[PDB]
Amino acid sequence: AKKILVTCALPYANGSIHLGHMLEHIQADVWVRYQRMRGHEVNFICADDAHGTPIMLKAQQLGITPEQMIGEMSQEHQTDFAGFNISYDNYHSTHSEENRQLSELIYSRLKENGFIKNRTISQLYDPEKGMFLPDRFVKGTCPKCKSPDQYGDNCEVCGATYSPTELIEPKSVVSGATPVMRDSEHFFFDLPSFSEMLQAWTRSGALQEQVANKMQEWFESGLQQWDISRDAPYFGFEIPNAPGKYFYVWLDAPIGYMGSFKNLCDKRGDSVSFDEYWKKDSTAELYHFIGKDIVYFHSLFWPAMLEGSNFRKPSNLFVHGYVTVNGAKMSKSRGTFIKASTWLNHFDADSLRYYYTAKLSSRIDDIDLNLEDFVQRVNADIVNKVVNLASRNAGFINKRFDGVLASELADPQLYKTFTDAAEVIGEAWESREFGKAVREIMALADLANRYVDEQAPWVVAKQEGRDADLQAICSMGINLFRVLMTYLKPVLPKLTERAEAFLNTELTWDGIQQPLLGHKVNPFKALYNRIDMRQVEALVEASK
Ligand SMILES: CSCC[C@H](N)CC(=O)O
Ligand SMILES: CSCC[C@H](N)CC(=O)O
Ligand SMILES: [Zn+2]
Numbered sequence: 001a002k003k004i005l006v007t008c009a010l011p012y013a014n015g016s017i018h019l020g021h022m023l024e025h026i027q028a029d030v031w032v033r034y035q036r037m038r039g040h041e042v043n044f045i046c047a048d049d050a051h052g053t054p055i056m057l058k059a060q061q062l063g064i065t066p067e068q069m070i071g072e073m074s075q076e077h078q079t080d081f082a083g084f085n086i087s088y089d090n091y092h093s094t095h096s097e098e099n100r101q102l103s104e105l106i107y108s109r110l111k112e113n114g115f116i117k118n119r120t121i122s123q124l125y126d127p128e129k130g131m132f133l134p135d136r137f138v139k140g141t142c143p144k145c146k147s148p149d150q151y152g153d154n155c156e157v158c159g160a161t162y163s164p165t166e167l168i169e170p171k172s173v174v175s176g177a178t179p180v181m182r183d184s185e186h187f188f189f190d191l192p193s194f195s196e197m198l199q200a201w202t203r204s205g206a207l208q209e210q211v212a213n214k215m216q217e218w219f220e221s222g223l224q225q226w227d228i229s230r231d232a233p234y235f236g237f238e239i240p241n242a243p244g245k246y247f248y249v250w251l252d253a254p255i256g257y258m259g260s261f262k263n264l265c266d267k268r269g270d271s272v273s274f275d276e277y278w279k280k281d282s283t284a285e286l287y288h289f290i291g292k293d294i295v296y297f298h299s300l301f302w303p304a305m306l307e308g309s310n311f312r313k314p315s316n317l318f319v320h321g322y323v324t325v326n327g328a329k330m331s332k333s334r335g336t337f338i339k340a341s342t343w344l345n346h347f348d349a350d351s352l353r354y355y356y357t358a359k360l361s362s363r364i365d366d367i368d369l370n371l372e373d374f375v376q377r378v379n380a381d382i383v384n385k386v387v388n389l390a391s392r393n394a395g396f397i398n399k400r401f402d403g404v405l406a407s408e409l410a411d412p413q414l415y416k417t418f419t420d421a422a423e424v425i426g427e428a429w430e431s432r433e434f435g436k437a438v439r440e441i442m443a444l445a446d447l448a449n450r451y452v453d454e455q456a457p458w459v460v461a462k463q464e465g466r467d468a469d470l471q472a473i474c475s476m477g478i479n480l481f482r483v484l485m486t487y488l489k490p491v492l493p494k495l496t497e498r499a500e501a502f503l504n505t506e507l508t509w510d511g512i513q514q515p516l517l518g519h520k521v522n523p524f525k526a527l528y529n530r531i532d533m534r535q536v537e538a539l540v541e542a543s544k
Pocket of ligand 3: 142143144145146147155156157158159160
């Protein structure tokens with residue numbers, strides 16, 4: 001009955017999707033699929049983040065328009081996410097008319113309400129190319145150790161940090177010219193005016209405790225005005241009434257959540273839902289799934305922007321940790337920096353969805369993809385616990401009972417134990433305690449396989465006159481499988497489809513209360529095969 005808008009962070013246009021992105025998009029998708037199963041109106045929204053200096057320069061280097069380049073990456077990203085069955089209702093772009101109009105609107109409101117300040121700053125400028133240089137586009141000699149060819153504000157030899165204005169013999173990364181300091185008028189968003197509002201949100205108990213604790217450190221350091229303009233040349237949105245000035249990408253980027261929703265509404269011919277979700281008096285819920293590195297933008301700048309422009313604020317932020325592989329940050333040299341597209345050449349989507357879900361919780365801790373453990377866990381849990389209930393039982397039903405399940409449950413008490421678990425499992429999905437849900441589900445799968453072992457169908461099947469017993473046992477196993485696959489439906493969409501085809505039924509949350517009795521099932525070829533370390537070794541080699 002709820003109306004829910006869920007987003008994931010908008011991926012950078014000039015990088016391929018990797019396993020770190022996938023942690024976020026999978027976490028959100030599992031949650032979204034569960035909410036849809038419980039009957040809510042869910043809108044799952046994303047987009048590519050397509051603006052800024054790096055994108056402008058990369059397109060120039062490639063000799064194509066930035067529009068051509070971002071279009072190609074958008075397609076690549078969407079192909080990858082589709083391969084993982086991420087169920088967006090809309091995937092748009094920050095480079096869109098909807099985002100342009102909303103960015104101009106919000107800026108205009110902020111300005112009228114007194115939250116935009118003008119101040120002149122000094123910044124390094126490449127006089128040959130004719131552009132201001134972000135820090136990482138300045139290189140030079142470390143002032144401390146005198147090592148050459150250091151970029152931006154830090155030295156990768158001695159570890160020193162400094163302003164790029166301190167580099168010896170600085171050079172533009174773009175042209176090789178010596179940059180010089182130049183003045184420019186910038187526009188600033190008055191974040192400090194929202195301090196009290198933001199502190200009250202932090203204290204409210206909605207946010208993850210770890211995020212609220214970090215917010216306190218940020219308040220203690222002191223909020224500052226935020227520079228939200230960039231000079232031409234730029235790839236982005238021009239500021240009304242300010243020729244040669246553009247909105248900084250991070251101003252327009254979260255507005256792209258709104259732009260993507262507006263685009264969806266407009267394509268659907270829906271003239272009411274945008275305001276229903278975004279007006280101050282909204283009764284819809286708004287959730288952003290994000291990583292740790294972008295919390296500042298989403299927890300401070302974004303709710304302040306919304307408040308200052310007469311829009312509702314997020315209901316919650318759901319922050320996750322970083323992905324590690326084999327315990328460490330992804331490493332190109334070790335072949336553990338793994339692209340989403342590469343993953344799918346070696347493994348299916350469900351395997352990674354399962355593994356991440358088994359490790360995820362409501363806290364912000366890092367999630368480790370241990371590749372040896374991945375093989376062991378997928379084989380143990382998917383192949384040998386859950387799918388086993390179907391695979392060990394279906395053959396007898398198809399071959400000796402014409403595909404027809406028994407007319408009554410062999411063990412109604414055991415079935416009730418399984419259905420009674422729905423409340424705790426659903427609460428675990430809802431609360432993002434995914435690992436707890438998976439532990440509960442796998443404890444049930446253990447009980448189901450213990451039931452089948454206790455009945456010993458491999459013995460019953462050879463014994464004269466025991467056909468009815470065999471049908472009973474195997475049907476019971478299949479009914480337990482039906483329940484477990486319902487609980488796992490948000491996690492394993494493709495396996496679920498194959499299970500639904502076998503069972504001749506769509507799996508619904510409430511449907512588990514009616515077991516399959518006197519019911520025809522279909523034959524199947526392997527629902528889920530084992531994986532092995534040779535495949536992991538190939539993945540790693542392909543990623544080097
Ligand atoms: C509105 S969420 C935007 C997220 C950024 N594109 C993440 C990044 O580029 O690192
Ligand atoms: C509480 S989450 C925000 C704090 C993170 N340590 C910021 C980062 O990882 O860049
Ligand atoms: Zn140095």
